[PDB]
Amino acid sequence: LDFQFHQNDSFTLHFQQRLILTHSKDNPCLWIGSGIADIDMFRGNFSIKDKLQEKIALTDAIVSQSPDGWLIHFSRGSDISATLNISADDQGRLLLELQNDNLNHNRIWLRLAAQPEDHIYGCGEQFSYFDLRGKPFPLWTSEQGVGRNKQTYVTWQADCKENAGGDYYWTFFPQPTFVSTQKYYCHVDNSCYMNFDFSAPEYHELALWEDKATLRFECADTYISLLEKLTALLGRQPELPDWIYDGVTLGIQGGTEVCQKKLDTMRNAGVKVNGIWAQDWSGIRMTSFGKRVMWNWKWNSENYPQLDSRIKQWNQEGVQFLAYINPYVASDKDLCEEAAQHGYLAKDASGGDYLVEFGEFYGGVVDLTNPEAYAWFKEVIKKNMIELGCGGWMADFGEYLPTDTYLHNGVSAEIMHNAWPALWAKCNYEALEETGKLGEILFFMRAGSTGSQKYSTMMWAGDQNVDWSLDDGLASVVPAALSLAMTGHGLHHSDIGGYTTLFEMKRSKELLLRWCDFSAFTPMMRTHEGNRPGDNWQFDGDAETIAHFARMTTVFTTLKPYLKEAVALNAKSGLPVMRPLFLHYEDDAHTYTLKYQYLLGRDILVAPVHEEGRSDWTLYLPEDNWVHAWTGEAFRGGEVTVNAPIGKPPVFYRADSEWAALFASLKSIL
Ligand SMILES: O=S(=O)(O)C[C@H]1CNC[C@@H](O)[C@@H]1O
Ligand SMILES: [Ca+2]
């Protein structure tokens, strides 16, 4: 279970026969040192550099047997040392606790042994890679980037005035947790800046900007079993409300009458509609970016007259109303004033209230480390959204904490920055828990951190461009779902049609309908107008568009019994709803390299069309008896090509599924 072999100051550590650590004087496992962080932010985009002062290999290791395991004193002369404790924890997990000699040694580099053939998955929500082997991954929550690839034109345009284009590793939800194909997970407790480097064939290197580190590992015989264990450590999500399965949630702005009119147009045309999502429930702010929300979390009766009574009528017709909140407060409005009066805002170095620039306006940061401010903001949600009758909301942002804020708990903003998303999620979760609404109300988040696996009821993929790019278009959503599934979050959707509308990018009708085909094979369907609604093709753009939504929402609703079962398994044991093919086909080597296809539950395989102008699509089937959803044709394992016009996405089901007869009914929809 634990094999430590000591000897010339050299050792190895095996754990359930996996080699975890090796150390000798010539090949050390540990370096320590110091640096001065050089971090700046503009509008959520961060520039991060180290001024590295020292990096020193600790070649001398003195070992002793301990109360619960082994203690290693590492050093390089008397002046430079650290201690490592090796134990089991309360549940049998390997526990490594590292503490440097003093606080001035604020850098660590730790190497873990690896094999050249190993694949690595997770690190939160990753949009450019699913398998992480071969590259390094900085872990710092931020804006996710527009374009995200230096070689593409839009990324270059987003970089022109502002550091906004980003790169392959930028994300709203990085997490210091990964899975190896030696069938273990590694979880790090720290929230400091970290870089997890998976590029060397013989070792993984974990770099931390702190004087201590805590890591836990567990193994298992299958990936399914490993995810059950990972979610028993980090959390499991609740079952979704029953109405999520009942149709599409329409994203609409412009007030009570506009919402009513668009609702009737779609319902009257045969579309299954379960909800209206109106982010402008609190008012609007026009900026050069386009149409934004007014960040003051109170119902605006000028934009939305009679909303309270109108929600009661919509609910009797089987339609829910969903709103919008974030953990910041516009500086020109009432809630910010109320928070300043009480001292509820994050401060600057001089003790004044810190105002962040959010894109042509300013806002305060509600200090969620102050228990009274956190209680106050939870009451804002309960009184202004739950009591109004909202069935859910977008719970946005979490990524913008500057490193020169000062917080009520006295912990550096260099450490609290990455921890803010799960603190925000917990605020939402407890609002629901204290009003008895878990399983009835649904909120959805884009940002996350350790513990969002418990506290976030649903993830969405944040802001994609209204384009076909691999790094920031429709395609990018699949690695995002898969990476999070491997980090213990199994409920994921996207904006139908994407969001970011800039430069020459504008949403075509073809993009909207292909994205609709994709989302009908996920656990939630919800549209978005985008930041410039007049430049994008919308769900009611023409009769053909409306009819495509009626067909594909009939497809999604038909799947209800199946999806409900999958969501219940995710709640019970962390078995995610959208699954990497290797969860069920562990001996197929080729499945470990796929990024753009997934299993929906156990029995459906989906390979979404993510390129413009296609009439067919090529994909990989693992070895099983498959049936093409739309033709009923039989297929076996191998590379295959199928016809794929709009409305017939590349979808296959297992012939031997207990659900085969439900899936066979799909080809008879109009
Ligand atoms: O423009 S707003 O900041 O108010 C709201 C948008 C930003 N976050 C993600 C988008 O989906 C929202 O519409
Ligand atoms: Ca983006």
Residue (of 142, 666, 231) closest to 447 by Cα position: 142
Beta partners for 87? Answer: 69, 95
- Residue 462 in tokens: 């944040």
Distance CA 270, CA 268 (A): 6
Q: Which ligand is nearest to the CA of 285?
A: 1
Catalytic residue (one of 246, 367, 463, 603): 463
Q: State the amino acid at position 128 in one-letter form.
A: S
- Residue 165 in tokens: 């284009």
Q: How many whole angstroms from 292 Cα to the centroid of ligand 1?
A: 6
- Three-class SS string for 561-602? HHHHHHHHHHHHHCCCCEECHHHCCCCCHHHHHCCCCEEECC
List the end-to-end C-alpha distance of the chain, in Å, as a whole number.
58
Distance CA 305, CA 463 (A): 30
Q: Are the C-beta atoms of 591 and 607 separated by less than 8 Å?
A: no
Residue (of 223, 190, 226, 183) closest to 209 by Cα position: 190
Q: Render 457-500 in DSSP notation, one character per residue.
A: S-EE----BSS--TTTSGGGHHHHHHHHHTTT---EE--BT-SB
Distance CA 588, CA 584 (A): 9
Among protein residues, the one whose CA lies closest to atom 4 of ligand 1: 293
Q: Which atom of ligand 1 is nearest to the CA of 324?
A: 5
Burial group, residue 234, by CB count within 10 angstroms (0-12, 13-18, 19+): buried
* Sign, Cα dihedral of 86, 87, 91, 94: positive
Among protein residues, the one whose CA lies closest to atom 10 of ligand 1: 463
Catalytic residue (one of 125, 143, 205, 399): 399
CA atoms within a 13 Å half-sphere pointing along the CA-CB vector of 367: 24
Q: Which ligand is nearest to the CA of 505?
A: 2
Distance CA 609, CA 203 (A): 36
Q: At what angle do helices 307-316 and 256-268 cross, to 10 degrees?
A: 20
- Residue 612 in tokens: 């413009």
CA 300 to chain centre: 31
- Residue 326 in tokens: 């974030």
CA 524 to chain centre: 15
Distance CA 341, CA 525 (A): 41
Distance CA 234, CA 251 (A): 32
Among protein residues, the one whose CA lies closest to atom 3 of ligand 1: 292
Q: Which atom of ligand 1 is nearest to the CA of 446?
A: 9
Catalytic site includes residue 399: yes
**Range 515-528 burial, b when 16+ CB lie within 10 A, else e:** bbbbbbbbbbbbbb
List the 248-251 sheet strands across, edge first.
Answer: 492-493, 459-460, 442-445, 392-395, 320-325, 273-277, 248-251, 525-526
Q: Which atom of ligand 1 is nearest to the CA of 499?
A: 11
Q: For the chain, give me the number of helices (H) and strands (E)? A: 13, 38
Catalytic site includes residue 430: no
**For 35, phi and psi rounded to 5 degrees?**
-155, 165
Q: How many whole angstroms from 171 Cα to the centroid of ligand 2?
A: 9
Q: Which of 144, 394, 397, 443 to mutate to test the pocket of ligand 1 (most atoms within 8 A of CB)?
A: 394
Residue 201 DSSP code: T
CA atoms within a 13 Å half-sphere pointing along the CA-CB vector of 205: 18
Catalytic site includes residue 396: yes
**Arch. (CATH architecture) of 578-670:** Sandwich (2.60)
Catalytic residue (one of 218, 367, 396, 471): 396
Distance CA 216, CA 574 (A): 19
Burial group, residue 500, by CB count within 10 angstroms (0-12, 13-18, 19+): buried
Residue (of 118, 115, 112) closest to 23 by Cα position: 112
Residues at CB less than 6 angstroms from ligand 1:
279, 292-293, 396, 463, 499
CB atoms within 10 A of CB 658: 11
Distance CA 610, CA 475 (A): 5
Annotated binding site: which residue ranges?
279, 292-293, 295, 528
Residue ranges of the chain that CATH labels 2.60.40.1180:
578-670
Q: Which atom of ligand 1 is nearest to the CA of 397?
A: 8
Q: 63-70 long-range contacts, Cβ below 8 Å, gap at least 24? A: 63/6, 63/11, 69/2, 69/4, 70/4
131 contact partners, CB below 8 Å, separation of at least 6: 119, 120, 121, 592, 593, 595
Residue (of 595, 605, 600) closest to 638 by Cα position: 605
